[PDB]
């Protein structure tokens, strides 16, 4: 069953290309790093499960994502954290909230247009078999 490892290799490579495209985008630079504890001291008191695109790239290489659902759960976590933390008052707040939705939508859009359904389905079935 190297075919299962080839499937997981192929998945990781895909997910790296997607995460790369998001990380090089100027809009999502704020989501490439963890939140600055010194600049945003109350962030940790709101968000208990932080996520960013550096963490995602690390988890890809550690084999934490066996399915696209697993990957997109962390993408969603990045967005929901941003919408959970930031209020809807100042224009800086609205800029970041909008970028977070944009990050999520962009990820889902790329995957929808480039991921073969039968390949996604394969990965889902391999992890259930384990």
């Amino acid at each position: 069953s190297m075919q299962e490892e080839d499937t997981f290799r192929e998945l990781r490579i895909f997910l790296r290309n997607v995460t790369h495209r998001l990380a090089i985008d100027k809009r999502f630079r704020v989501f490439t790093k963890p939140v600055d504890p010194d600049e945003v001291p109350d962030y940790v008191t709101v968000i208990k499960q932080p996520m960013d695109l550096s963490s995602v790239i690390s988890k890809i290489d550690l084999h934490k994502y066996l399915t696209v659902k697993d990957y997109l759960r962390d993408i969603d976590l990045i967005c929901s954290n941003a919408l959970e933390y930031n209020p809807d008052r100042d224009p800086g707040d609205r800029l970041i909230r909008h970028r977070a939705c944009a990050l999520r939508d962009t990820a889902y859009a790329i995957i929808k247009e480039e991921l073969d359904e039968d390949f996604e389905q394969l990965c889902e079935e391999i992890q259930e078999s384990r």
Binding site: V40, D42, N86, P87, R89, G92, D93
Partner: peptide, 6 residues
């Protein structure tokens, strides 16, 4: 700080 960055 209160909520919001910057």
């Amino acid at each position: 700080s209160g909520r919001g960055k910057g």
